[PDB]
């Protein structure tokens, strides 16, 4: 009843497929990894980035979790992002949102009473819903998850932009850029929602949020 | 520069491609999700869940971090676990190591002195290794890498069934069962390294560390 | 060389004055404890609440961390938040911040690009900061780090109130103070800086942001 | 009846004699702090460092969580030492715990399936209590606990010495030693349980573990 076989003997088969089609797509990379991207997304089974993307192996280094939040002290979302940036040398970093995310719901309308640590982590969600809270006021229920899917990708988007692993790494001049893009799970098509962020002049211009402020606000003291 | 159109043009003919032959392949789960696997893997980009199964949008709700690591007080993880045992009600959950993984030959020669986060969070992998110095000590650099991995996967396995998720989900008569797997970039072939746990005797069988006795401990005092 | 000695002569010198002058003072608390208060405050060494309140062993339960910060995601201070409310059932939660506070100055200052974990540590104050720009723009250096400190401990305060801990003891009707306080290092007194708060009416009336939206927002939906 | 009053007027009748005992008491400190000492401790109301080594304000930086755990992982203790041994170059390291602590018993006696954040956090005392098995095997549990307590004293000692932070500071050659103490409750009185560590000799002499064997596991590879 809780048996392996048809999963081991559907990758025997897809193995078999892919050393047919081509004889070195997987010898290619036993030895290492030189991927191009990173993709954060959210655990829900619907969204493959290797798959959605259409993907070989070595080609997308993957962090997905609940929300696809990102967070400067979450280490687990931290070291996907400085190994990437600092060891792999990877040039674009893909964050993702989905619509129908249940994280994005549950940031909505759960009470922060509720028990366990789902409702722990989605603490996140209900921070960029409470600075948004204006452009959600008096929408309907399935409106406002749209937008908050929306919200909740751009505010991750500006955390990668803000991470000191990617203000470091542009303020050596390595070359990296940040995607905010979300996915319908109904139709299979991804969307671009902001534009490619190469550095701090791109921020400026792309982000609700000013991360130049973010950076430099002791500037502004007198 | 570092435009995203052919990520673009690969996914809607990918999507378009699926609809084709299966016109609700996508829309069947575009309000919902029922999946019956958590994979836990590894970030690494060679490694795809999703893809080495051959598995459909819906199926495997996945966890991917930095050398496939399981810890009580990582909320990341904790609550991939939770969501998919306490909500979506999951059957099986996959942990999953593999062959060349960065994270588990860091844990093997990184100094602790090493700076960045990439290095706290592999203290985990240490900790499997200082346990297991007698398996280790003398291999050559590579049959110990090997051998890590392995040894890494059983710990993790460990980990989900000790985790308070697996056991407050047991202890209710949840039908839930752990395994524990490996995938070799170099072939894209899965074995099964550890045979299915489903509940507490199971363990006691297919288990080096003690699970009972780590679960009542109390017992052996007096 | 690096003797521990004196401290223990002083110790020793200390334990003894104390029980000579009341019998029972530690053999009371010998086998348990039943404090009153749980107290947040900074990890600053001119800041020992048992001290400055003149308070006896078993009468404040200490957290202690770098800039008095209180967050959901964080096991450490939430473990003491769930253990005093839920286990000892105190009832008062003490939120202290100080003027002089390195924390407050560093997330005024830092680049977020800054090495290191204090710089991921301190993001919460960053957080407080960008959301309160209005206020802390133009002012002086020194002025600017005092409100700060200010607006931190009143943060505080909103995410212990916000916390699913306090708000579980809440709903079950459980006595539950919280208070905001500020300390002068140069002088040795506490101002109190927010008025005791007991549930969500006094909490609408004391605290700049809505807990009540926070916590019931699918209520502003349709 | 939630009302701050005894204590501000208890702070109050403190400051005024401490300022009348000496006028520079607390001005000597109001603008920084140079403690010589980073304490590690338990949260219990029952033992508070400053009061205990009879201590004045400036004298020692404090960490207070429920366990004394200290972890590579939580950036809530790694951020207050990383702060005090980089930034203020505290020379003296105090990991302290003590008899009769609420988390070691629980860290003996509770089943992993108890729910909440607590259960979580104190995963660190039964990987401690694991691996010291053989030492606790038909103890009478008042004698367990009092041994648990010793061991994670022990462990935590350890957990500073191979903290990055830590190997850092005596590569290159900073002076910082770390001690471990216990401290009875019942009597006031602290004891010192492991003698001075000032760098990798002392732990080769002192530790149960070994921390060379830990920092440079990779030349016993082949
Ligand atoms: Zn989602
Ligand atoms: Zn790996
Ligand atoms: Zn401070
Ligand atoms: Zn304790």
Same mark, same amino acid.
């Given at each position: 009843?809780?048996?392996?076989?048809?999963?081991?003997?559907?990758?025997?088969?897809?193995?078999?497929?892919?050393?047919?089609?081509?004889?070195?797509?997987?010898?290619?990379?036993?030895?290492?990894?030189?991927? $191009?991207?990173?993709?954060?997304?959210?655990? %829900?089974?619907?969204?493959?980035?290797?798959?959605?993307?259409?993907?070989?192996?070595?080609?997308?280094?993957?962090?997905?979790?609940?929300?696809? /939040?990102?967070?400067?002290? %979450?280490? #687990?979302?931290?070291?996907? &992002? $400085?190994?990437?940036?600092?060891?792999?040398?990877?040039?674009?970093?893909?964050?993702?949102?989905?619509?129908?995310?249940?994280?994005?719901?549950?940031?909505?309308?759960?009470?922060?009473?509720?028990?366990?640590?789902? #409702?722990?982590?989605?603490?996140?969600?209900?921070?960029?819903?409470?600075? #948004?809270?204006?452009? /959600?006021?008096?929408?309907?229920?399935?409106?406002?998850?749209?937008?908050?899917? $929306?919200?909740?990708?751009?505010?991750?988007?500006?955390?990668?932009?803000?991470?000191? @692993?990617?203000?470091?790494?542009?303020?050596?001049?390595?070359? &990296?850029?940040?995607?905010?893009?979300?996915?319908?799970?109904?139709?299979?098509?991804?969307?671009? &929602? @902001?534009?490619?962020?190469?550095?701090? $002049?791109?921020?400026?211009?792309? /982000?609700?949020?000013?991360?130049?402020?973010?950076?430099?606000?002791?500037?502004?003291?007198?």
């Amino acid at each position: 009843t809780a048996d392996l076989s048809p999963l081991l003997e559907a990758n025997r088969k897809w193995a078999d497929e892919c050393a047919a089609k081509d004889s070195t797509y997987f010898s290619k990379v036993a030895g290492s990894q030189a991927p $191009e991207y990173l993709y954060i997304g959210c655990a %829900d089974s619907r969204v493959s980035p290797a798959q959605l993307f259409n993907m070989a192996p070595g080609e997308v280094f993957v962090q997905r979790n609940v929300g696809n /939040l990102v967070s400067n002290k %979450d280490l #687990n979302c931290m070291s996907c &992002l $400085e190994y990437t940036v600092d060891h792999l040398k990877i040039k674009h970093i893909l964050v993702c949102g989905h619509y129908n995310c249940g994280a994005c719901k549950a940031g909505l309308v759960w009470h922060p009473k509720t028990a366990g640590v789902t #409702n722990l982590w989605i603490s996140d969600v209900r921070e960029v819903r409470d600075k #948004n809270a204006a452009k /959600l006021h008096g929408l309907s229920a399935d409106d406002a998850w749209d937008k908050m899917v $929306e919200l909740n990708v751009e505010a991750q988007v500006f955390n990668v932009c803000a991470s000191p @692993i990617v203000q470091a790494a542009w303020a050596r001049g390595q070359p &990296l850029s940040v995607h905010g893009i979300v996915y319908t799970p109904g139709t299979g098509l991804v969307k671009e &929602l @902001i534009k490619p962020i190469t550095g701090m $002049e791109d921020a400026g211009a792309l /982000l609700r949020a000013d991360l130049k402020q973010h950076c430099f606000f002791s500037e502004s003291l007198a």
